Design a protein around this ligand. Sequence first.
Ligand SMILES: *C/C=C(\C)CC/C=C(\C)CCC=C(C)C
Lengths: 469, 163
Amino acid sequence: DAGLISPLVQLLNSKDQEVLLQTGRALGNICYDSHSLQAQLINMGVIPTLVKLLGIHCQNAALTEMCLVAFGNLAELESSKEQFASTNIAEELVKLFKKQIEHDKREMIFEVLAPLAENDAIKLQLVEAGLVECLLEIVQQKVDSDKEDDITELKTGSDLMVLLLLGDESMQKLFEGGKGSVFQRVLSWIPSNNHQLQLAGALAIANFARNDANCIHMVDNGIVEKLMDLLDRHVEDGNVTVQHAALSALRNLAIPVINKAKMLSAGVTEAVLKFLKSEMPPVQFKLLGTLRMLIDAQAEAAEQLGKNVKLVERLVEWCEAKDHAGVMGESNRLLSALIRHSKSKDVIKTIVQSGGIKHLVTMATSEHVIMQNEALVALALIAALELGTAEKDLESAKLVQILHRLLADERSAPEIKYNSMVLICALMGSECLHKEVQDLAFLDVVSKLRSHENKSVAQQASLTEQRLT
Amino acid sequence: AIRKKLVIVGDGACGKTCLLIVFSKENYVADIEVDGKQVELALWDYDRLRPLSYPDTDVILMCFSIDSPDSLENIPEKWTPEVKHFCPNVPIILVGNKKDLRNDEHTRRELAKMKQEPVKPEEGRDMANRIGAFGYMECSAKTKDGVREVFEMATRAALQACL
Ligand SMILES: *C/C=C(\C)CC/C=C(\C)CCC=C(C)C
């Protein structure tokens, strides 16, 4: 077949319009639904040759159509995008999108942009060419128009704007820095009553909000306040898709330590908790995300959230759901995080009563090592502060049995903090029952000693506490 | 080479993780491997958010276990609404995990204690056409029966989206 194609491709160099149209029709079928041959066409390499054609014969209708369909098919292959990025195709598709007006002719150009856009480098090229400008005018015209064609032309342009904001270079160019000339116009979508624009806006924001510096400069210019207005609109019912998008942005805006404070004062923790009732896991997820980020360095905030019985009861409810378990995890970590940051005796008593000990214990046997000691540290706090109120539920959970298993390990340096939760749990009468289960043989081995200096000492001190008192 | 992504979802993940670890020959990369025309499948601080519709997902595998008809009836209420709203236009494959334990002495007898019996392929296809699946396919994790036939089907679903 390389016999067949070589001449067909060398025909593409023809200045004759009719020649192309036919050599095209030929090249068309086969390779129709034969990716093997399409792939070889990339090597040839036809892509940069085709981009030139589109450029020269754009005021033609017949091949320009056919040219686009080629790109749409080729772009489905992996090799294509790097090759496309060499090309002027970004400039040439925008230069075309302006000229053409008919709904059919645009949707074809859109179905080329969308897969080509996935290439982060193309994104920048498209923004530089001025796609962003066109996209926004398509939104503006058709905001309150209810033609079924017009609402889908809106959705395309709006969701594509979002897509373009996933490229780090391209996004950073548009956030000018926020507030710039585009970012402003995208912000205004969140006050808007166009359910799609609300969605796009929230998502766009969240995508802008992907580095410390941007997220700071947004919280300070009242983005946090605007997002809460959107959430407050969708509380009782019903657009789950938008709840998510808005929450998802807050979660990001609450990453850097500086904003954590500022957002609590504005009252995000309140507005976010209104969706505790939600039964939609993605909404549940970004709720729990935003809580855990808001409380990170903030102790007093965590003390109220821990004391909040409405919340803690929902968390123990989510921990005990077998599925999803994306939301189960995030929930389980927040239980730990409430205890760990507040260090409050009250928040502990709230959680032990809600039945949260048995979950923190099973989280100590998690495959992720970060979560492991988050459980162990939250359990260390539980034992140091309020061992009496906890000890009955702790035997139930089989915590003593797990810690011995943990400390003959394959392995972690997280075994240290376990040898502390053992040393601390040891001083409860109903408590172990570690002497009735023989930890002394494992402790003196670890005493002498792990590569960690810190692992040796508490273990050598744990040897002395386990022999004497 | 063509890259397509495959999400997978279901009640308890000793039924599902059994399905994708058996193809060694929350993130994994198998292949065909590679039958000459190459198709690769990727599986399932700052969050990056994708619009709809331009999702980084080409096909969902909604898994239920044949030994629990509770886990089949949960599909329309627990799994489908999520995909409804967030992943529309993403083709679905309904999948009956662990087909080996259907007519078994231990587990159809234990199912009777629930006033119940195992799931038929009638009840499977009924659900598939209900939720709007691209298709159905039962498979056993432990006996290796129908396992490649799911990843065959998933890939065919992914590809199907001149002049
Ligand atoms: C189904 C169509 C495929 C695989 C692509 C066929 C077209 C080309 C290759 C490029 C020919 C385009 C022009 C001559 C304008």
